[PDB]
Write a protein that binds this ligand. Structure first.
Ligand SMILES: CCCCCCCCCCCCCC(=O)O
Ligand SMILES: CCCCCCCCCCCCCC(=O)O
Ligand SMILES: CCCCCCCCCCCCCC(=O)O
Ligand code: SF4
Ligand code: SF4
Ligand code: NA
Lengths: 197, 61
């Protein structure tokens, strides 16, 4: 789908989404194409109409460079998004580690970002269930309990786990929280179960 | 009583007049409530259909 020079092989995410007139059901769009084909004076005339519409798409479709959240190959590519919908993951030749190459996970495995199961509010345990609570109360409780165990049991009674899914800066801040704020060296990431050897 | 001509007018403050003017516009919307409601429904369909996004993009780009 990436290397195909036309729409012959395309991502289902692009179908009916990229264009302004591509949402029109094929039942109505097919006669429109047949009408236009018959009417057509020249290719350059209707190519100009198509170019103006192509230019307009820049209002809707947002193309953003990202680095794959999955494995260590480090594939970078552009995400084409109309609102919150991912239309297609468009690889670029300039991508230093992968070029135009992708696997099913980086090319098509991004549904989780829009999953209805995505956590959108902090949860504070209230007995046998989780209570949806404001960010302030969740942060205030973490500060109150972390300070409580640090005073009564010491800074070394608090461990911190960094995610190798998260960024370099997020790893740096987790260890700066553990060492510079809490005062412990209890930091680690999934590399422990992985390439520590 | 004796003849007098001088009239001390009642103070219509800037904020008081602003409320009067806004309330006059509110009353006009209330009177044309059905027409506004119908315009909004029509506008909502222009957005559902290709129309409003197409115009937003035509002027945007
Ligand atoms: C082409 C139809 C244009 C309709 C113009 C509608 C103007 C709406 C005015 C809204 C006034 C709000 C009243 C207020 O804020 O107190
Ligand atoms: C009525 C609600 C808005 C629908 C769009 C109408 C504006 C179209 C542009 C007309 C102004 C112009 O370019 O002369
Ligand atoms: C004044 C607003 C109510 C009149 C609505 C105008 C009807 C046409 C809307 C624009 C359609 C278009 O430009 O394609
Ligand atoms: S943009 Fe035109 S030339 Fe390119 S795939 Fe679509 S119909 Fe074919
Ligand atoms: S696209 Fe596939 S190979 Fe490339 S980084 Fe993502 S998961 Fe790894
Ligand atoms: Na392609």
């Amino acid at each position: 789908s990436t290397v195909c020079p036309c729409n012959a092989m395309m991502e289902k995410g692009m179908e009916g989404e990229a264009g302004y007139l591509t949402g029109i059901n094929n039942e109505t769009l097919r006669p429109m194409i047949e009408i236009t084909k018959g009417v057509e004076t020249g290719y350059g005339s209707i190519l100009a109409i198509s170019d103006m519409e192509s230019a307009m798409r820049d209002e809707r479709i947002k193309k953003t460079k990202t680095v794959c959240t999955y494995c260590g190959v480090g594939c970078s590519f552009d995400v084409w998004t109309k609102g919150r919908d991912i239309l297609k993951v468009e690889p670029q030749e300039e991508a230093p580690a992968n070029g135009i190459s992708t696997c099913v996970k980086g090319k098509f495995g991004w549904d989780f970002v829009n999953s209805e199961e995505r956590l959108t509010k902090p949860l504070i345990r209230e007995g046998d269930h989780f209570r949806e609570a404001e960010w302030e109360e969740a942060l205030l409780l973490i500060a109150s309990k972390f300070t409580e165990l640090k005073e009564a049991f010491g800074p070394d009674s608090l461990a911190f786990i960094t995610s190798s899914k998260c960024t370099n800066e997020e790893s740096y801040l987790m260890q700066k929280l553990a060492r510079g704020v809490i005062g412990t060296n209890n930091v680690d990431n999934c590399s422990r179960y992985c390439q520590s050897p | 009583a004796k003849a007098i001509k001088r009239i001390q007018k009642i103070e219509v403050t800037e904020e008081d007049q602003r409320k009067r003017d806004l309330r006059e516009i509110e009353d006009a919307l209330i009177d044309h409530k059905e027409a506004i409601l119908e315009t909004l429904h029509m506008l909502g369909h222009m957005n559902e259909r290709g129309v409003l996004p197409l115009l937003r993009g035509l002027f945007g780009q």
